[PDB]
Each structure stands twice: as C-alpha cells, then as structure tokens.
Amino acid sequence: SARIMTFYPTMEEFRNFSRYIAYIESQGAHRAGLAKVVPPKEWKPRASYDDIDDLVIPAPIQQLVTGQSGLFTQYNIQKKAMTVREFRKIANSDKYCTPRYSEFEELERKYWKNLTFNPPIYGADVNGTLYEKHVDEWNIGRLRTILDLVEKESGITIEGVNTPYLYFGMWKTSFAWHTEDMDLYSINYLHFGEPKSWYSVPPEHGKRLERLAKGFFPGSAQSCEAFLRHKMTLISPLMLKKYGIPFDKVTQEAGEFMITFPYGYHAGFNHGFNCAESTNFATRRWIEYGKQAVLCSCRMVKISMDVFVRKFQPERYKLWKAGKDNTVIDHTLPTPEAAEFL
Ligand SMILES: Nc1nc(-c2nccc3c(=O)[nH]cnc23)cs1
Ligand SMILES: [Zn+2]
Ligand SMILES: [Zn+2]
C-alpha cells in the first residue's frame, strides 16, 4: 500500500534504463515516490575509489540546524574548498564519526536527538561523475531520457539537473524535505561508504505535507508559494506520524540506486563517510507535472515546457498556451511507456 519497492534487474533488464523505469511503474513503484534498484553483481561503474583523494570539493557546507519538537530549519554555511582527503579526515575523525549503534532505529533516534549539535560538513553539489568513460548501463552522465531535449534544442545546461552532481557525506549530513526541480524524476547512486537513509511521502499525499509545513512555518509560506523548494525544512518521522502524514523509510547501501518519482517528497541523512552521484531525468508522464509544478516565487531552476508540449502534446499546445489546459494529474497512473508490461 504505496510502500517503497526494491528491484533486482538481470544484466539484460539492466541494459535499457528508460524501459526499466516503465517496468518498475507497471509494478506500482511510482506510488511510494521512491524505489530502490539493486544492480546485477557483474556491474561496476568504476574499478576503484582509492584514486580520488585529491578531488576538489569547491563549496563544502557546514549544516547549522535550528529548531525543537521535530521541526527544524537548516542553514548552510559555505566553507573554504577542500580535498576528498581533508574531508575524509574530518568525516572519519572522533569529533564527526558515526556513533555506536545496534539497529537502524537507534541510529535514527540519535540523528533526530543530535541534529542541532556539532554541525557536520557536506561535500555537496560537486560537478562531476565517478563513472568510467565506457560504462554504458545506468550512466548518470548520459541516461538518454526525454529530459535531453532541453540541451538538444538549446544547448543550455543546468548543474545537477541535466549534468551529474557528487555528494560527499559524513554522519548527520542531511537533505531537507523536497521534490525535484520542475517535479522531475531523480536517480541517486551510492558509489561507496556508509549508508544513506531516506524518508518518502507518496505523491498522492504530497499536498498534505505542504499544508502541514505551511501551518508550522507561516512566515516562510507567506514569503514564498513553494518554500520547501529552498530545501531548508526538516520534519521528523514522529511529527509526520502525529499529523497523520503517510510516509515510508528505506536505507540505501553502497552500490544501490534510489529513484525518486515526480512530486515525490523525500528527506534523509548520511550514516557516515560516503559518496553519491545524482541527476534528474524524465519520462512522458513527467510532462504534466512540469506544466503544473509550483515554483519558488521569492527568488531558482525553471525549465521551458514549450518544447515538451510542442513535441509530445501538439494537440494541447494552443489550449495550454492560452491558459485553458485544465488537466488533473492522477498520481496512480504509470507512464505511457509502461503499456507493453500492462
Ligand atoms: N533536487 C535536489 N535533490 C537533492 C537531494 N535529493 C536526494 C538526496 C540528496 C542527498 O543525499 N544529498 C543532497 N541532496 C539530495 C538536493 S537538490
Ligand atoms: Zn532530491
Ligand atoms: Zn522561494
């Protein structure tokens, strides 16, 4: 019942990325807003990670968290550029390393208890890829989805959106509740290290989480229509439970992929020193989400939907451009590409 699903594709199933997203949607994976994909054992994107210690993290961020009673605001403080070595030194030090724990529920408890203490540093938004040049399956650098149209027609690039981002984590580093820019899909691969825990709200209950955040942060909601887009709001699983917001949790381990679906609210934290690579992608189903996404009004990323409507919805272009497209999204419907599996 809209629970996070895990998939284990064969090497043959793994070779076609877009076809596999259509397959996981025909299985109802999009309903949770988050799905896990475990690659075939024979697949590796890079032979070793012992040769990246001198890699530059240009803008590392000290994550300052303020709040109480399961409601917090994350302030990012830019620090001087450092290497993966200097970063790992701080990450694996006694001051910033992972505390001792028996089960995930205990580490999750420590996270929500200590989130405001000892601000960690996040090696976030590093422009790059750790994939070897001749890796042809699930290459984050080149997924080959319909999102490619923006770069194809204009050549414009949006860092981390249609290019890959690297994220060097440490214990207690986190990402606030949010949906992707333009309500796009996202792919996350944990290259190595300690796990990454994720929280997810099904897209069909997403307007509920927004309403709740508006009630808890009225000043923030008055200044911006979509303040959650600022990626500063942390809401504990206990608060979500209290206010009856349906959600699920999952832990991503090194060598696994996490996929977020359009309008899928997600949050989470790093268990310790690790590295993840991510980008956004799209399917034909995303078009409607992109046309209807509520963007930051104070305040940011904005993609012109005209090329997508022109190519995939030509009949509705005149109606849509005149403000007469009164289409209602059904979050339970899979992507049209999934037709072959249904
Ligand atoms: N659209 C965006 N998605 C994210 C994001 N989404 C999911 C996971 C992460 C993460 O682990 N670290 C940093 N950012 C993450 C940041 S901006
Ligand atoms: Zn995200
Ligand atoms: Zn805003």
Note down, in words, how this protein is organized.
The protein is an alpha+beta fold. It has a single domain, classed as Cupin (Jelly Rolls, Sandwich), CATH 2.60.120. 24% of the residues lie in helices and 25% in strands. It contains eleven helices and 16 strands. The strands form three sheets. It has a ten-stranded mixed beta sheet. Strands 9-15-11-13 form a four-stranded antiparallel beta sheet, with no helix packed on it. Strands 3-6 form a two-stranded antiparallel sheet. It starts with a strand and ends in a 21-residue tail after the last helix. One zinc ion binds next to loops. This is Lysine-specific demethylase 4A. Belongs to the JHDM3 histone demethylase family. Interacts with histone deacetylase proteins HDAC1, HDAC2 and HDAC3. Interacts with RB and NCOR1. Interacts with VRK1. Interacts with FBXO22; this interaction promotes KDM4A ubiquitination. (Microbial infection) Interacts with HTLV-1 Tax protein.
Q: Sheet bearing the most strands, described?
A: 10 strands, mixed
* Ligands bound to this protein structure: the ligand Nc1nc(-c2nccc3c(=O)[nH]cnc23)cs1, zinc ion
From the alpha carbons, calculate the radius of gyration and give it in angstroms. Answer: 20 Å
Please name the fourth-level CATH homologous superfamily: Cupin
Order of helices and strands: EHHEEEEEHHEHEEEEHHEHEEEEHHH
Number of strands: 16
Q: In the CATH hierarchy, what is the class?
A: Mainly Beta
**Helix content estimate:** 10-25%
Shape: globular
- Helix/strand/pairing class, anyone? alpha+beta
Strand content: 15-25%
Number of helices: 11
Question: How far is the N terminus from the C terminus?
Answer: 19 Å
CATH topology name: Jelly Rolls
Oligomeric organization of the protein chains:
monomer
Instruction: Enumerate the strands of the largest sheet in spatial order, edge to edge or round the barrel.
Output: 1-2-14-10-16-8-7-4-5-12
**Architecture in CATH?**
Sandwich
PDB class: oxidoreductase
Keywords: Oxidoreductase, Epigenetics, Demethylase, Inhibitor
Assembly: monomeric
Entry title: Crystal structure of human KDM4A in complex with compound 40
